[PDB]
Amino acid sequence: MKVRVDADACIGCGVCENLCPDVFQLGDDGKAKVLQPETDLPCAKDAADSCPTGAISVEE
Numbered sequence: 001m002k003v004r005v006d007a008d009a010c011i012g013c014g015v016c017e018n019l020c021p022d023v024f025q026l027g028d029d030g031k032a033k034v035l036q037p038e039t040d041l042p043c044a045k046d047a048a049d050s051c052p053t054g055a056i057s058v059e060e
């Protein structure tokens with residue numbers, strides 16, 4: 001549900017870390033990309049309609 005990550009798109013907003021620490025989180029450089037690849041958790045279903053950078057792409 002999130003194999004293609006979009007970095008240049010992400011805009012350090014804070015819509016993933018809140019979602020779920022499994023795949024939706026952040027780093028120290030600020031860039032908020034994907035941490036988990038095949039995030040199967042139930043929090044990325046909504047992450048699709050949440051993350052404004054639609055960076056967690058489902059290439060599942």
Ligand code: SF4
Nearest residue numbers: 013014015016032051
């Ligand atoms: S929710 Fe999406 S746009 Fe917001 S910080 Fe996380 S990855 Fe970046």
